[PDB]
């Protein structure tokens, strides 16, 4: 869980600005595919993912080398509380019904 | 909702808590004062030890930046909501510093205006 918190809040902010996000699990990569040109250690973010899935707030899923999130009303509400997001933000995935 | 600095200092310390800050003791405090990041600070009063308060005052006088003085500073840290670690433990916060501008870049609040008034006069 040993990633400095600035990347944590950045990832949470981009998560809620986009909705769900993807995860590739590997230690041999130099730089993240989507998060390239930043040099973010993958192990720390992986530990953060397994911690939040063990903490019991996003339904933990191990799906064949490629991970996704599980968004729900409870998960979105908890992310809002944890990131202290303003009470005006709505995700772009629910646009126009 | 009394519009005064005394009551909004709880909100300012909540902001200093959640948004970085946490300059307890000597650690993480010099960043705001040697860089002139903090142009308005809050200092603990009724201290038995002049060491920490006088070092904070010396760092402030390095650029001569004023400070906010209130009493019952431990109740503020009780009301900041510092439980954290899911729901493990009940720690307390001794001091914090308001960094980068008088107020942070997040939500616009009344506390920023009241502390602007306090710094002005």
């Amino acid at each position: 869980m040993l990633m400095p918190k600035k990347n944590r809040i950045a990832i949470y902010e981009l998560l809620f600005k986009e909705g769900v996000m993807v995860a590739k699990k590997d230690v041999h990569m130099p730089k993240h595919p989507e998060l390239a040109d930043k040099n973010v250690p993958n192990l720390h973010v992986m530990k953060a993912m397994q911690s939040l899935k063990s903490r019991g707030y996003v339904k933990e899923q191990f799906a064949w080398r490629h991970f996704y999130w599980y968004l729900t009303n409870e998960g979105i509400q908890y992310l809002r509380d944890y990131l202290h997001l303003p009470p005006e933000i709505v995700p772009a995935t629910l646009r126009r019904s | 909702g009394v519009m005064d600095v005394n009551t909004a200092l709880q909100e300012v310390l909540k902001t200093a808590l959640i948004h970085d800050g946490l300059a307890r003791g000597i650690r993480e405090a010099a960043k705001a004062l040697d860089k002139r990041q903090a142009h308005l600070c809050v200092l603990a009063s009724n201290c038995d030890e002049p060491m920490y308060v006088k070092l904070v005052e010396a760092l402030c006088a390095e650029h001569q930046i004023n400070l906010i003085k209130v009493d019952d500073n431990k109740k503020l840290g009780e009301w900041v909501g510092l439980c954290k670690i899911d729901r493990e433990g009940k720690p307390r916060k001794v001091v914090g510093c308001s960094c980068v501008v008088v107020k942070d870049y997040g939500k616009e609040s009344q506390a920023k205006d009241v502390i602007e008034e306090y710094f002005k006069c």
């Binding site: - | 003791g25 000597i26 010099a30 030890e49 060491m51 070092l55 010396a58 390095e62």
Partner: protein, 74 residues
């Protein structure tokens, strides 16, 4: 394989231990015939580090991580 009985050599290491005063006294230096704090240590032009990092005078070697100039007292 069988368990190596990992007690003959390095059973387990413990975390780093240091002695630190609750309010720093070693980082700030007093006694310069001034009523306020006086910075006798020469400031380094490298601003890539943090603002709270205090420049120290070491007798041998350098421990900075990015620049590590070479100088001595003679």
């Amino acid at each position: 394989k069988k368990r190596k009985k990992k007690s003959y050599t390095t059973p387990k290491k413990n975390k780093h231990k240091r002695k630190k005063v609750k309010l720093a006294v070693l980082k700030y230096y007093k006694v310069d015939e001034n009523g306020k704090i006086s910075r006798l240590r020469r400031e380094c032009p490298s601003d890539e580090c943090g603002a709270g990092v205090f420049m120290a005078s070491h007798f041998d070697r350098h421990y900075c991580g990015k620049c590590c100039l070479t100088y001595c007292f003679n």
